[PDB]
Design a protein around this ligand. Structure first.
Ligand SMILES: *[C@@H]1O[C@H](CO)[C@@H](O)[C@H](O)[C@H]1NC(C)=O
Ligand SMILES: *[C@@H]1O[C@H](CO)[C@@H](O)[C@H](O)[C@H]1NC(C)=O
Ligand SMILES: *[C@@H]1O[C@H](CO)[C@@H](O)[C@H](O)[C@H]1NC(C)=O
Lengths: 185, 291, 149, 185, 185
C-alpha cells in the first residue's frame, strides 16, 4: 500500500463525483465529454506529459528537454535516496500541476458563491484532497490565500470554463494515479 | 451466558490438536432433557465432516473413530434429524492436525549502517498446520540479553529496536531462535557473530564528477558516505561495455587523478565502501551516475 | 475483410492498419488522431474524416489462461485468470478491471474484481465467463472468456 | 446534522458489512438469520429496551423500573441542561450496551487470531467506531485492555457464538440509530 | 524574536545547567575548565568554524575550502529565498554539528545507565532541545535510534570523555547562539 497512491485514488474518485454533479446541475450549459474541447492549462509550464513515464518506456532521454523545470523538490512521498531522477522530476511536475489547478479552482469557487442562487459550487472535499497530496509531494507546500472579488463576474463564462477544467483535470488525475501505482509496484 | 451448544455436547479424544497420523474419537452426546419431541424409530443423530455423513445412531450417544486425517482443519458437525422437521445443528468440533515444528537451520543478523537496528532472519522450514510462536534472543559477552517474540504465524524477520554499540570492535554476540507449538519445540543452534560481521556499511549517498577542473581526461569524483570507512572501491568500467573496477581506492572521500577516457561520452559510475577490510561486508553499489 | 449478408445487400467491410510512428513516448495525449479515407468509385470521388483518442477507442482482448480450481471441501470454486500478453506493459501503469458473470445457462451474476482471482459458487449446469475493460477510463468491454463449469 | 447520529449511522453500516463477511467466510457454520436464535447479552443489565423511546410513546413512567441503572453519566453527545431525563438515562444505557459488547468482541478476536489459518477475524474499523461513539456518550470512557490467552480454545464454539452476537448487535445498532435521529429532530 | 534563536538560547542554558551538575556529581574525576583539554569531535567534518561568520567579517571567500560539505539543506529556520549562501551553508553545518553530538551523547547515556548507582546521567531535557533545534534546521531530520549494549563498559573512561565533550559542546552552543542573534538582527 502506498499512502500517496491512496491520496491519488481518493483524488480520481473525488473528481469523478464532482464531474457527475456538474453535468446534473448545469443541464443547459454543455458539459458532455463530446461537446467540451480538451484544453490543458499546464500545456507548456510542466513536463508531467514527458517525465512521468515507466522507466522501461523512457530510454533516449533526448525528449526530456534540457531538464525542463528540473526543480526536483524533495518530499515525503518518496525518499531522497530511493528512486531515479526520472521519477523525482515527475513528482515535482505533479506537485506543480496540482498548484496550477488549485489556484484556478479557488478563483472559480469565489466567483460562484456570489450567485444569487446556489446552482453549483466546487467540492470542498476535492480541494482538500488536492492540498493533502501536495503537502506529501513537496515539503515547501504553499497554501493558496482566501480569494475574493469586490465586483460580480458574468456567471455563464465561469460555468463554461469550469466544465472545460473539470474534464481536463480528471485526465490529469488518472495520470497521477498510474504513476503512484508504478511507484508502489 | 451465551452458549453455542444447547441441545448436546461433543467430545474429542485425545484433543483437537493431534500429531499427524493419530486417530480421534469424536463422540456426540445428547443431554437427556433435549431431544426429538416425538420418540420415533425414524429420527437420527448424524455426524458430518465438511457436511459429509460419517455415522448415524438413533440413540443419544454416538461414537466415531476417524483415522488418516490429513494436515489441516476438519469441521465435524453433529446434527439432529427428526421425523418431519428439518435437521437442527446441535454442536460441532474443529480438529487441527499438526506435526512437530521445524528447527531454523540458518540464522543471520544484519545491521544496516553504523547506526542501524539489528535484524535477524531464519529459514522456518516446513509449515506445521498449527499456531507458531517465534522467540529471538540476543546475548552479549556475559549473559545479558535482549528478547523479542514474533507472535505472527509467518515472520520474514524479527528486528531489535535497540541499536547495538560495541564496547570494543572485536566482541562476541550470540543469537538463537526458538519455535514452540502445541505439539513440540525446536531451537536453532547458537551462532556467534563479531560486531564487524553484523554491521554492513551504507552505499555512499553522495557523488560528484569533475574533470580535475579542466578539459583534461583525468577525472576527480567527490562522494560522501559514513565516516568510519577504511577502504573503498570505484567503477571505472566504460559505460558501453563493463570491463574492470578497481579492487580498492585510497581512504579519500574525494577521488583525485582517476584515469578516465578522453571522450566526453556518458559513463555510468558506481561506488562501494568497506567498513573493515579484515571482517566487514562490502556496501551496495551507489545509484549509477550518468556521464 | 469480410463479406457478410445483411439483408440481401451483402455489405463488404474494408479496414486499414495504422501505427503512431512518433518515437517519443508521452504519458497523455493532447491532440486527437485524424483519419481521412478518400473513397473513389469509377468517376465518383468522396472523402470521410474521423477524429478520436487511442484511450477512447481501446478495446481489450479476452482474459488469458482462465482456469477453475475448486477449494478443498467447500461449495465455492476459486477461478484464476491472467493479463493478455498483447496488452501494453508494464501491467502496473496500465491496468484492467475484470467483470465475472456466472449466469451461463441469477439474471446478473456479474461481479467486478480488480484482483486476478475471484471465488464463485458453481452451479453444475452453468458456464463462468470473464470480461476485461480499462480500469482507469471507460472503454469498450472485451469479448467474454468462458470456461465450462 | 448530529455528530453522534453520524457515528451511529457509521456503526450500523460497519456491522452490516461485517455480517455479510461473516456469512461468506463461515459457509458451513450456520449464520443465516433464520437458523440463528436471538440472544441478547444485555437482557437484564441495561434499560435501553424501555428507556430509549420517543417522548410521545412513554407516558405512565411506571414501566421504568425504579430508575433502573440510573447512572445518568454526563457526556459530549448531549448537553447537561439540554434534554429530559428520559433521553439522559437512554444515552447512559446505550454507553453501557456498547461497553458490554466491545469487551466481549475483543475477547472473541483474541481467540480468533490463534487459528492456524485466518478464516475470519473481527473488523478493526467496527471496533474503533464503537470506541469513538462511547467517548462521545460518556466522558469517563474506559478503554478495554489488550486481551490475550496462554492456551488455544475450541474454534467451532467461538465461530457459533460470534454469529449469534453479530446478528443481535445489528438489531441494537438500528435501535441506537433511531434514538440518534430522534435527538437530531 | 527568532524562534531558532529562542531554541539556541534554551540550548546554551541547558548545557550550562548540565555542566554545573557534572562538576558537582564527579568530585574526583577532573572536570574544571583548566584541567580538561579542548577536543572538538567535529574538527574537520564540518565548516561551522569558517562558514558561520558575520557577512562583514568574511570577504575573500578563498578560505571557504571548495564549498566544503556544501549540502545546503533547506529548512524551517530560514526561508529558501531569504538569506545569502554564507548563512545557508552555516545552518547546514550547525545541523551536522548537532547530529554528531546527539549520536555520541545517546551512546554515553546508554553506557551510564548500566552503573549500579546513578552518580550521573545526561539530561533528557538537553537532548530534547538538540532534537527540536535540528528539526527546525533541516526538514530531513533523522531521529537517532535507541542505543543499548549487551555488556558493561569501564565507567571511568566514559566519565572522563563526558566532561571533555560537555565543555567543548558549551563553546559550540555559544557559537550557534551568536549566529541566531545575527540572523534575527
Ligand atoms: C476410542 O474409543 C474406543 C471405544 O470407545 C476405544 O476402544 C479406543 O481405544 C479409543 N481410542 C482412542 C485413541 O481414544
Ligand atoms: C552464560 O550462559 C551459558 C549458557 O546458559 C553458560 O554456559 C555460561 O556459563 C554462562 N556464563 C556466565 C558467566 O554465567
Ligand atoms: C570470540 O570467540 C572466538 C572463538 O570462540 C575467540 O577466538 C575470540 O577471542 C573471542 N573474542 C572475545 C572478545 O572473547
Amino acid at each position: 500500500m502506498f499512502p500517496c497512491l491512496h491520496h491519488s485514488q481518493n483524488l480520481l474518485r473525488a473528481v469523478s463525483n464532482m464531474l457527475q454533479k456538474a453535468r446534473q446541475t448545469l443541464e443547459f450549459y454543455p458539459c458532455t465529454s463530446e461537446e467540451i474541447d480538451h484544453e490543458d492549462i499546464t500545456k507548456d509550464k510542466t513536463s508531467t506529459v514527458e517525465a512521468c513515464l515507466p522507466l522501461e518506456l523512457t530510454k533516449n532521454e533526448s525528449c526530456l528537454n534540457s531538464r525542463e523545470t528540473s526543480f526536483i523538490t524533495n518530499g515525503s512521498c518518496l525518499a531522497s535516496r530511493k528512486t531515479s531522477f526520472m521519477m523525482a522530476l515527475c513528482l515535482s511536475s505533479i506537485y506543480e500541476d496540482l498548484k496550477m489547478y488549485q489556484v484556478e479552482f479557488k478563483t472559480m469557487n469565489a466567483k460562484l458563491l456570489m450567485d444569487p442562487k446556489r446552482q453549483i459550487f466546487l467540492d470542498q472535499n476535492m480541494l482538500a484532497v488536492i492540498d493533502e497530496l501536495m503537502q506529501a509531494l513537496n515539503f515547501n507546500s504553499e497554501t493558496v490565500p482566501q480569494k475574493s472579488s469586490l465586483e460580480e463576474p458574468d456567471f455563464y463564462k465561469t460555468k463554461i470554463k469550469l466544465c472545460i477544467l473539470l474534464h481536463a483535470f480528471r485526465i490529469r488525475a488518472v495520470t497521477i494515479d498510474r504513476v503512484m501505482s508504478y511507484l508502489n509496484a | 451466558k451465551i452458549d453455542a451448544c444447547k441441545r448436546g455436547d461433543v467430545t474429542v479424544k485425545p484433543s483437537h490438536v493431534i500429531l499427524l497420523g493419530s486417530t480421534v474419537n469424536i463422540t456426540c452426546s445428547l443431554k437427556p432433557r433435549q431431544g426429538c419431541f416425538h420418540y420415533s424409530r425414524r429420527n437420527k443423530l448424524i455426524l458430518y465432516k465438511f457436511d459429509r455423513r460419517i455415522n448415524f445412531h438413533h440413540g443419544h450417544s454416538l461414537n466415531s473413530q476417524v483415522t488418516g486425517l490429513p494436515l489441516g482443519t476438519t469441521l465435524f458437525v453433529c446434527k439432529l434429524a427428526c421425523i418431519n422437521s428439518d435437521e437442527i445443528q446441535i454442536c460441532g468440533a474443529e480438529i487441527f492436525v499438526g506435526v512437530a515444528p521445524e528447527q531454523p537451520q540458518n540464522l543471520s543478523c544484519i545491521q544496516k549502517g553504523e547506526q542501524g537496528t539489528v535484524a535477524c532472519t531464519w529459514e522456518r522450514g516446513r509449515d506445521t498446520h498449527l499456531y507458531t510462536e517465534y522467540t529471538l534472543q540476543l546475548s552479549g559477552p556475559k549473559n545479558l540479553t535482549w528478547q523479542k517474540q514474533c507472535k505472527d504465524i509467518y515472520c520474514d524477520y524479527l528486528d531489535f529496536g535497540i541499536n547495538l554499540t560495541p564496547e570494543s570492535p572485536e566482541s562476541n554476540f550470540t543469537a538463537k531462535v526458538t519455535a514452540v507449538n502445541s505439539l513440540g519445540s525446536s531451537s536453532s543452534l547458537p551462532s556467534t557473530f563479531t560486531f564487524l560481521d553484523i554491521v554492513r556499511p551504507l552505499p555512499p549517498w553522495d557523488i560528484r564528477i569533475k574533470f580535475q577542473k579542466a578539459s583534461v581526461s583525468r577525472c576527480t569524483l567527490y562522494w560522501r558516505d559514513e565516516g568510519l570507512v577504511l577502504l573503498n572501491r570505484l567503477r571505472y568500467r566504460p559505460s558501453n561495455s563493463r570491463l574492470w573496477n578497481m579492487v580498492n581506492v585510497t581512504k579519500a572521500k574525494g577521488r583525485h587523478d582517476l584515469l578516465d577516457l578522453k571522450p566526453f561520452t556518458e559513463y555510468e559510475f558506481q561506488i562501494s565502501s568497506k567498513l573493515h577490510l579484515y571482517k566487514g561486508s562490502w556496501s551496495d553499489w551507489s545509484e549509477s551516475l550518468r556521464a | 475483410s469480410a463479406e457478410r449478408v445483411r439483408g440481401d445487400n451483402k455489405e463488404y467491410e474494408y479496414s486499414v492498419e495504422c501505427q503512431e510512428d512518433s518515437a517519443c513516448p508521452a504519458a497523455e495525449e493532447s491532440l486527437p488522431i485524424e483519419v481521412m479515407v478518400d473513397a473513389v468509385h469509377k468517376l465518383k470521388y468522396e472523402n470521410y474524416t474521423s477524429s478520436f483518442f487511442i484511450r477512447d477507442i481501446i478495446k481489450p482482448d479476452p482474459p488469458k489462461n482462465l482456469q477453475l480450481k475448486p477449494l478443498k471441501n467447500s461449495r465455492q470454486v476459486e477461478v484464476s485468470w491472467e493479463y493478455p500478453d498483447t496488452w501494453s506493459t508494464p501491467h502496473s501503469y496500465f491496468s484492467l478491471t475484470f467483470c465475472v458473470q456466472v449466469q451461463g445457462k441469477e439474471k446478473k451474476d456479474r461481479v467486478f474484481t480488480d484482483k486476478t482471482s475471484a471465488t464463485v459458487i458453481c452451479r453444475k449446469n452453468a458456464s463462468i465467463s470473464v470480461r476485461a475493460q480499462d480500469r482507469y477510463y471507460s472503454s469498450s468491454w472485451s469479448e467474454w472468456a468462458s470456461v465450462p463449469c
